Amino acid sequence: APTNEFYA
Amino acid sequence: APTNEFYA
Amino acid sequence: GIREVILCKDQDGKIGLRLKSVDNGIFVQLVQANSPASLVGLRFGDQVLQINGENCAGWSSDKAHKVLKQAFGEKITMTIRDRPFERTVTMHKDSSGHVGFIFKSGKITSIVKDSSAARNGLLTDHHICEINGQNVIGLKDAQIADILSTAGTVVTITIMPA
Amino acid sequence: GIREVILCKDQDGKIGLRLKSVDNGIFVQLVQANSPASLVGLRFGDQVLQINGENCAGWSSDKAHKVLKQAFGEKITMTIRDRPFERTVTMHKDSSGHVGFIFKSGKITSIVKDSSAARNGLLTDHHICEINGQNVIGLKDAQIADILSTAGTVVTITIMPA
Numbered sequence A, B: 001a002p003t004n005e006f007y008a
Numbered sequence C, D: 001g002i003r004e005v006i007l008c009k010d011q012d013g014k015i016g017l018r019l020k021s022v023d024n025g026i027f028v029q030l031v032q033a034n035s036p037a038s039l040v041g042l043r044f045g046d047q048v049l050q051i052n053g054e055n056c057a058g059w060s061s062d063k064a065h066k067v068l069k070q071a072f073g074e075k076i077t078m079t080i081r082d083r084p085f086e087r088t089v090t091m092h093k094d095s096s097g098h099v100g101f102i103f104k105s106g107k108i109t110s111i112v113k114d115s116s117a118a119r120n121g122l123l124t125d126h127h128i129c130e131i132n133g134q135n136v137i138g139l140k141d142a143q144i145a146d147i148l149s150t151a152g153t154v155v156t157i158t159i160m161p162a
Helices: C035-042 C062-067 C140-151 D061-070 D141-149
Strands: C001-007 C017-020 C023-032 C047-051 C075-081 C087-092 C100-102 C105-109 C128-132 C154-162 D001-009 D017-022 D025-030 D047-053 D075-081 D088-092 D099-102 D106-110 D126-131 D154-161
Touching: C001 C035, C017 C062, C023 C035, C023 C062, C047 C062, C100 C140, C128 C140, D017 D047, D017 D061, D025 D047, D047 D061, D099 D141, D126 D141
Parallel strands: none
Antiparallel strands: C001 C075, C017 C023, C047 C075, C087 C154, C100 C105, C105 C128, C128 C154, D001 D075, D017 D025, D047 D075, D088 D154, D099 D106, D106 D126, D126 D154
16 A cells, blocks of 8 residues: 655 | 542 | 634534534634635634633533534634644755655654754644645645645744644 | 754753653753753753754654763753743632642643633643743642742643643
């Protein structure tokens, strides 16, 4: 499954 | 047993 | 910051506001846009002290909603504490255009080492409330990401414990 | 906002400062009286961004104290974000000398109806950190009680979630 995390 | 509570 | 507030109810019997009970207090959970709430300035995380002069202390969320539902009159009066526990952090993008943190569902989960986020003390487990003065509560992570990437090098975020 | 401080060690090589790690950041936990710390205006809740040019992000409490202890030279430089004062609640004693909450082991357990605490939206399961500028973390309930009762009519308290 995707982690659906975002990097800023 | 005592509640050992304080009232402020 | 405590202030008093007066709402005039909609067209369809509602003020566009949902509340939550936390630690025997009442807090703004959600504000719908262009609602009576919006015009007046309510935001996610604001604390509702009283509604119509009656203390909200110890109320269930359901209760606060019944009180707001069974509102006599078209005017609702609310005593408000402007969002407590709020913090503000100003970061600067690096060459790669990053400030150095991971987020997921509007929450900051980790801080990249030696980044602008680290040197300026960004906190984990905090929601992202505003980015450069622009509200992002209720937005999807992609939208937040776009707001972040289309900002300049200066990224000022207001955050709040989860 | 953000400022730099230069702390000169006392006669016993200490600066009278005590830190604590919260959400991957570092905060001032204790400042002792007539210490270098108190004299540069350090206060509970202030965030420590840097110590001697080094980012505090993600340190443990133990690590922070190790760094303060091992600090070489008689000067310690810190970069600090002054507290925003967003965790503060002010109450007035009623005619009975009563502000309106019950506590045990330094934490608030319930809010009395129709009281100042109720009117100002005091939260339960929060630790009593400060009473009128005075740090009470780690003090016995009786001590906290005496401080509260010998306080003036107006009581301002800093609280933190347990």
